[PDB]
Amino acid sequence: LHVAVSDSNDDVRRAAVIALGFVLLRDYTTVPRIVQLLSKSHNAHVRCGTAFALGIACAGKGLQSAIDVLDPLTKDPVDFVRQAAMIALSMILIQQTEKLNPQVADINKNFLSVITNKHQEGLAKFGACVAQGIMNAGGRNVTIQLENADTGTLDTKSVVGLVMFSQFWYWFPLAHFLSLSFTPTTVIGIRGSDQAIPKFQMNCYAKEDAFSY
Amino acid sequence: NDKVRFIKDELRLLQEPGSYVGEVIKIVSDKKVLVKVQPEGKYIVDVAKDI
Amino acid sequence: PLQVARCTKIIKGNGESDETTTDNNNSGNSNSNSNQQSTDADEDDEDAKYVIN
Amino acid sequence: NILSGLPTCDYYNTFLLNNKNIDIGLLNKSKSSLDGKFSLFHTAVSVANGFMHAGTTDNSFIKANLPWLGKAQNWAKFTATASLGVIHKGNLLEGKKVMAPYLPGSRASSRFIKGGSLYGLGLIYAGFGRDTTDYLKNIIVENSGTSGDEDVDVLLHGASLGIGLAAMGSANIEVYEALKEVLYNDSATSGEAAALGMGLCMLGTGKPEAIHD
Amino acid sequence: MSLQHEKVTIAPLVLLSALDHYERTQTKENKRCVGVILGDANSSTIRVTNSFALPFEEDEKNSDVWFLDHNYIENMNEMCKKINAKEKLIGWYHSGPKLRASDLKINELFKKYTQNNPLLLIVDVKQQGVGLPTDAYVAIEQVKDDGTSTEKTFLHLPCTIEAEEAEEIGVEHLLRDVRDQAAGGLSIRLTNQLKSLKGLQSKLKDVVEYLDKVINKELPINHTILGKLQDVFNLLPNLGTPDDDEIDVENHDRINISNNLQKALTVKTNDELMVIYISNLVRSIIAFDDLIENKIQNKKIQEQ
Amino acid sequence: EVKRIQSVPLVIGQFLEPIDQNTGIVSSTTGMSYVVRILSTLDRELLKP
Amino acid sequence: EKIKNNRQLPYLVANVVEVMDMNEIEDKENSESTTQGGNVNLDNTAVGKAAVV
Amino acid sequence: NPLSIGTLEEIIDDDHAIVTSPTMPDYYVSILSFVDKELLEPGCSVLL
């Protein structure tokens, strides 16, 4: 926080805001309040970094507050501020809750419109493209996890991946490491004496999904 | 914070170039209009994206 | 575009008084000004230069 | 076998293959608005559609955006190549086979196809190939004495990222020693790739030697 | 020569270009480099406009053995006259960080080249002094205390920076720091007051040790430095004089103006408190009005 | 930074009238109508005539 | 060579209205009629030799 | 965009013309692109 205010250069400003949500990965709820002040900032760079931090923070364990914070950052006028917000929204609202949420359908098509628009800059279009890519990743059946829910321990692959993904402004081929952050969500039955998947049906309250189709 | 951004905003637009003012004499069907600038010649010039 | 100009004054481009180093007046010998002397430190053989409006 | 992680990948690969939703309308709407004869536009789509078919080997993309492929250029062409590894992730039996014609020694059309093919090889066999690292290991040390040649530098740029993913969390001093020579040269793009790859390798170690070096 | 040369104005280009000359020749660790300083002169204000390296060589066996190249100097003057007709020879920089006695001899070369006493400009590029990055010195001849001869000496002058217009624009732009001192808000000047006090003490300390060394370690007695201290002591305010007593009364009067000014802001604050307690009062009314309105919309569905 | 802009050189014009509360229209001593952003920290009640 | 670059074409045509010539040491310093110390020059920093065109 | 107005003084038959424009110096302009030599008459107003 101290470096984000005190060090006036744009790289240093942007990095330190991104860096907070890795520290407070598990305390993802309080982050919306702390970078509330940096969302509103008169410094474009700082707001760019605000948007990535919130994406990373609430990616696998959702939270409403961030989705709301990230909406004015979409609509923020600076080119790259917008670019950052679009990519970030799809990290958070990667398939979890989307049956209790009309929001997923609305954000998805917000990406569509930006691509259709010619009047938008290339940078807004870039942000829509990649963001539409993530949303429908995996065949619409993977999620971005941040930790294993079976041991309470941060996954090596996801967290390290994220850092390589976040920087792509300065070298563009450094943007395919979010592949490692995908983990399939699915319970797979294995047979104990034939090691193959059985067909078995379980009662489940479930879960219409067609909110990114 | 709002007070610093706005002063920078006042400053920003002064660095941007000036503006003018004419009156439309006639309408063109090329998606243009014919404007006559008040101390200056006629120009057929593209129109704003909001009209 | 090419601008439209028109000649309004004729000069002869030697004897003009273009170099002004060791010459005098506004006019030279009316055909020479830098070919009889190299105390100007220059020679030029340009004539009928013409002054447009 | 389970502790190797090899059958563990294959059980997710069964998931991804059966249950894929490829949406062709998203794909097609990207072809028209964001072009190929713009480098930035090409880059955005290549990444997007890589994420989208991620983890499920498919050639549907390749065949779809076949006239779009020939519009690639420059470093956009590199990214386009890198994106296939994201598509072809998993499937460890068939994993090599699919990067095989885009692999050097059996390619010669562009330096980007040959370079990003080696980045693409590393994404698939990340954590599942300790043999993988060595094959790529040859190319690192190979090009480190001939690195004043720009074409060659591009081939090496991609191998250094690829070997980085492969040896991630294995901590091999061999691999380290190889990327340290590309770095001590001061290679134009490949020193950048090699410095990142040293950190991936020696992930969590905290050893002073890597730290001072 | 010339007599008027009293204050030296120094462009921000000069400190940076000398800095660059030192490190682009790989002369370091007290291998000195001599370059010329060009500008205008013949007048009180001395502008150094531009600076450039010359070839130089130095010996560590006897230190009064050196090479200076004159031929390069001749070519430089020809070239730069066309660049700006505002560059003529005004002396030479010596790269520092210290003044030598060997710079006394090198000076006789530059005194011959240009008819003015030539400026010696020390550009401290090793920056071990917290002030003075530039020191200005003009060699002059004067008769010297303690019965001694007309000796050659270097007399310090003002070494000021005031900057050119041209220079100001790049200087502020590169700047992104809150500056060493700027003297803007109250925060900057509260820092400054405390900085000044440390400043006064540091100069004064060196003086203590000079007087100690005259009477213990036999450095020669220079009556100019003793005389300045006399003058210091005669402009020292004495308590219980009418001058000092007045200072005390004036402090009461300025603090009366401050007392009132602090109270005149409570008034400004007090306006705000009331405007916020009014705002809060409206948010209350708004909240009740909605809770009533949910009933009307509930009723409309049953109704139709 | 604003204060620099305010100092000289300046060209005289004459304020006519507002069209907004933050943009006005002037005509210069050049003989050109220019529609101009008005600066904050000046009159907008005694600016109107 | 520097002067010839100028004398080479095109160049503006004008007329001279009047000439105003002052000399060095106009008060004590300068060829201008202002008050400042030093800079005795012909026209370079202390202007007084001039044509109004 | 924009187009400066002209006024056509006269046509020289060789794929040029002379205009006098509210721009202070006159121009030898060319007749070219979606215009004909006989789609113009002298003294008619043209678009430059």
Next chain:
Amino acid sequence: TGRDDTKETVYISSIALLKMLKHGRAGVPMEVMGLMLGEFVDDYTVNVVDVFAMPQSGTGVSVEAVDDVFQAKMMDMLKQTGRDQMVVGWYHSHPGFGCWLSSVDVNTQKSFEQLNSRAVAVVVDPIQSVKGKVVIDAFRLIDTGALINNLEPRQTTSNTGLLNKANIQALIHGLNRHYYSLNIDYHKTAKETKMLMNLHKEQWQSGLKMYDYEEKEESNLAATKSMVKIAEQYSKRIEEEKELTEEELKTRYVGRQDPKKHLSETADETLENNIVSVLTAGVNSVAIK
């Protein structure tokens, strides 16, 4: 192709900056003709240690304004001091226009493009530089054949991918058909940093100085009197303000050049001065005696 054709990030040192501005502001009206001397590395990074104004000319900018005698003369003497560097492009002033290359400037550019294809042409307009980056920009020829076949963007990787241009006009017309534009960055060390900020030992000197008390007492009275007068305006304002519409309040009882606000700033200003005046005085009294 045979080059990466990616527009270079231009790092012109702070020493170089100062030079470049000085030479163009001097020569107004006039175009000043120089060369950039640095060292090109990578495929995207130029570092400009110093620049040279080659002698001013009356032909403007052309290939017939390069002077190879004068060029060489500069070069030969850098070698002899060991400060040798090579050209990475050239620079020039527009004395009262925006930043673009003309067709005629493109051909000057072309001479250096033979030498290395990462030649930059930098345009300075110093009547509009009240800031150090503004109205300066660097341009670089792209291959003519890349244009025909539409490989023209490919500067969008190996860079930030942000690109701030200035103006409609000549800029967009030459951008399209000749050159690719990218921002000039400005680079500096910490030895240079201390040099600018510092203002000798006469910087601390100002901070123990006291002033004539006629001017201090005068300063106080002026401010004091001022707050009586706009504080009758304040009385009117907070007598009313019981009526809805925020804008309507600002016309009627004022809120445009708001009296409460103007008073508060002036009151604070003189209050801060006089805290200083007593501190700096009491410091000297104790300190010096």
Next chain:
Amino acid sequence: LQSIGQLIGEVMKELSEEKYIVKASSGPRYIVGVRNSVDRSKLKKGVR
């Protein structure tokens, strides 16, 4: 060549001893500063 040409005005009317309104001979009225190379004890209204 390095002297550089100059423009003439006449002081149209005093506005401050800092700032003065000049009427340019080139055209438009301007408010211009003063330098330390001119005496403002000898700038007065209607001085060229």
